[PDB]
């Protein structure tokens, strides 16, 4: 089992859409009934659903949000009954200061749902997170529930998916410092999905709806094995293990027009694809340090195995000196066209990730040097009397990056 | 009530089927169509075969035995209903309605602590029926049949 | 068998609805007629009603009132010829000294309609009183009735359902006189379920009408298992002794416009949502001394062993260190719908209802020290001479705080 954790405007779309395509590949109902096809299914739902007396199934999911009005369009869907209306929560009434400071004074609310949430499931596995971390809310309040998530279960494993602000394009104009603590307590608290817009929108190209949509098909074929039991990787835990900073990317990224050239699709082809930059969906010899490639549909090991020898002689991939990839293979679900032969996703580990942080370093200090917008964070206690949290958070970031 | 015997049982013949013969027979007997004669062919059949082959006498047997059998719970259950029965045991006997125990018990202890006499078993089937009215159970059916008893004497 | 006293306006509506719920439950016409679904019904109800003559059931209830607007209401309503008439009292014609003062002068009637029903049941067990403790008529007329019961019935349970005063809203100016004489009196006569309206309204909101309807509900599912007979539990003297001050909580709290969220309702979250302070209908490491939970509806006993194991373990509740809960299952009456799949009540007894006397005495010494409003007082003959009455009820109070 599982929980999801989505905060801000782009965590609780992110949301929306990720329950979307669960339910999409589950079969089940937007107001939570089956449908009558799916209703022998063989397919595990107590990941991330729920089941209720009244047959419906109820999303592990809690809704945050500083602000009512994306939730009340949200509850305005034909998607709204699905949700449970007391999980939901929304402030009464774009600074990560602020936003702090209101998660250390509606602490109690939040750890009530969350206390309740957890123990209707026996067998509880780790934590999903869903926010941006550039603007207010999304920021300050994973920070806080992070932090307080650490403290408070440490057994659990607590994953994210951190949306990361353009940089091309000049959006919060306060984004550095944001980006910057919000890193730091990812680092000091998180367990272990890097996002951009920028990639994100750039490959889209060659609405938020279709961007988020992209999103969370990354989520749920990430998610897929754990999902549809199989005989390896039967567990979030066997995933990080097999890997442990990460970015990913998806080969049938196919619009629903794009389905006229139905191109003979072997397991080589996608595993290839996986590789380069360009499906990458993020923006010194830089290097690798961990490959992981979810493959759905029928797939024969002896393909895998002559896929991985062809790729392994012709070195496209470079790898650590200093120390010694993985193909794992799921069954999609029975109910969702398979208008792809075969299809691949790919999470990796590589070093080159490190630049984004020094891109933001690079923002931060060009402004630290001149105190700007540091106005409205004096006004929260935390940063009333000084900064030294922002010292050290940038120090911990040269810290990773030198580490890396 | 017959009984069976295995000092003069045959050899050959399982103690198995021999069950099964008691039970089909005494079915009979406590009971006081078409399932009638066709068996009486079978076991004429079999008195034509020249060689005792047991594979086959059971399958005689047992098609007789499920029949009667079926036609017996179709008995035990629809005609003579064994839920409301049972329902009546669960109540008294393992204090399934407690509830009429509690007054009992309220009404008939000083005549209890004291060791038993002759007289005491009468002293408490009143009780006991006054009780059964104490909590408007109301009901001349089932009511008699529930006799209480003393172990006096040995 | 039981009677009912309730007394003032809030005893004389309180009555009302707990008498509308109890005919809910066991179908009981509105004019004391029987259903036609309901003529061959298991329930018992010599409990709460005696059945007539014509076939119609009576309540063990009488009415008292210093007013009569209420009970004239009451018998405009269509429930009006369900009650006796012979039994209903009201005076010819708010202070605690003028309430007492006429329970002094009308013993003799009262007592007569309290010994006619009496002598009409072979096996009472107690009384049940409701009233309010601020206001005159309840506070003076109750302390007078549990004096002269107590006196006369010295082989009976006396159970109250007390209402006390909101004080985060400053309702009777003397209310702090009336509480303190009516807790004397609770504490020196009474057998054994706080209320307050602060609490219960704040409950309600996260007219009288609904909230004493939930307290009807309360009531209802505390007399439940002895209405519904089972295997255990089965009078109040058994409940009286598994306890022994009380606090209730109801789980399903839910209005008729919330049944949409069909949440699968085992019993384990039952029994852990009656454990939080939100719950508690009512407003130093302050602990508990005792808890009872009733539980309706399909209930598995390994389910309710896992529960008491799991919340053992997590040690949400404190308990006394000088001594050694309680969890009993009884069934849902067969008529009304059963919209929770499993459902759950619970009184407990804790220390921390301490608090609310220290406040009353707080209020009550912020006006001792200047004479305020006893001019009244000193009119009845009670007060006549001295207030002696006042003293001896503060040092009972602080007696009974210093115990706890």
Redesign the interface.
């Known amino acids: 089992e599982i929980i999801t954790l989505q905060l801000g405007q782009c965590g609780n779309q992110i949301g929306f859409e990720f329950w979307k395509q669960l339910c999409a590949e589950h079969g089940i109902s937007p107001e939570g009934i089956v449908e009558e096809f799916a209703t022998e299914g063989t397919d595990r739902k107590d990941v991330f659903f729920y089941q209720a007396d009244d047959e419906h199934y109820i999303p592990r999911a809690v809704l945050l949000d500083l602000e009512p009005r994306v939730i009340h369009s949200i509850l305005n869907s034909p998607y709204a009954k699905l949700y449970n209306p007391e999980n939901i929560y929304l402030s009464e009434h774009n600074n990560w200061a602020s936003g702090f400071s209101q998660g250390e004074k509606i602490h109690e609310d939040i750890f009530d749902i969350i206390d309740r949430e957890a123990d209707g499931s026996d067998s509880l596995e780790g934590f999903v997170l869903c926010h941006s971390i550039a603007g207010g809310t999304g920021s300050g309040l994973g920070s806080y529930l992070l932090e307080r998530l650490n403290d408070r279960y440490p057994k659990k494993l607590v994953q994210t998916y951190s949306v990361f602000p353009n940089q091309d394009e000049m959006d919060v104009v306060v984004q550095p410092y944001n980006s910057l603590l919000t890193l730091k307590r990812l680092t000091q608290n998180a367990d272990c999905v890097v996002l951009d817009n920028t990639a994100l929108n750039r490959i889209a190209t060659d609405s938020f709806s279709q961007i988020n949509q992209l999103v969370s098909t990354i989520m749920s074929a990430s998610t897929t094995t754990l999902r549809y039991p199989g005989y390896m990787n039967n567990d979030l835990i066997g995933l990080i293990a097999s890997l442990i900073f990460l970015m990913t990317g998806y080969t049938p990224l196919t619009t629903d027009q794009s389905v006229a050239s139905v191109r003979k699709t072997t397991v080589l082809d996608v595993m290839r694809r996986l590789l380069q930059p360009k499906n990458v969906m993020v923006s010194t010899n830089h290097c690798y340090i961990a490959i992981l490639n979810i493959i759905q549909g029928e797939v024969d090991p002896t393909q895998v195995h002559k896929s991985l020898q062809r790729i392994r002689e012709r070195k496209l991939a470079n790898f650590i000196p200093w120390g010694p990839i993985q193909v794992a293979l799921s069954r999609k679900s029975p109910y969702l066209p398979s208008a792809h032969r075969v299809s691949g996703l790919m999470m990796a580990n590589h070093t080159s990730i490190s630049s984004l942080f020094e891109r933001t370093c690079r923002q931060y200090d060009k402004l630290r040097k001149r105190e700007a917008f540091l106005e409205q964070f004096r006004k929260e206690d935390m940063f009333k009397d000084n900064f030294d949290e922002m010292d050290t958070s940038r120090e911990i970031v040269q810290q990773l990056i030198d580490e890396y | 009530q017959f009984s069976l015997r295995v000092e003069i049982l045959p050899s050959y013949i399982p103690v198995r089927v021999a069950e099964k013969i008691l039970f089909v027979g005494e079915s009979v007997q406590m009971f006081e169509k078409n399932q009638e004669d066709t068996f009486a062919a079978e076991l004429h059949r079999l008195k034509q075969q020249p060689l005792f082959s047991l594979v086959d006498f059971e399958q005689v047997v047992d098609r007789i035995r499920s029949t009667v059998a079926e036609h017996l719970w179709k008995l035990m259950v629809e005609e003579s209903d064994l839920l409301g029965q049972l329902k009546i045991i669960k109540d008294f006997y393992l204090?399934?309605?407690?509830?009429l125990f509690?007054?009992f018990i309220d009404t008939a202890q000083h005549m209890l602590k004291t060791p038993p006499t002759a007289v005491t078993e009468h002293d408490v089937n009143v009780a006991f029926q006054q009780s059964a009215h104490?909590?408007?159970l109301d009901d001349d059916n089932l009511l008699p049949l529930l006799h209480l008893t003393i172990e006096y004497h040995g």
Chains 1, 3 share one sequence.
């Open positions: 204090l399934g309605r407690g509830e509690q007054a104490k909590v408007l």
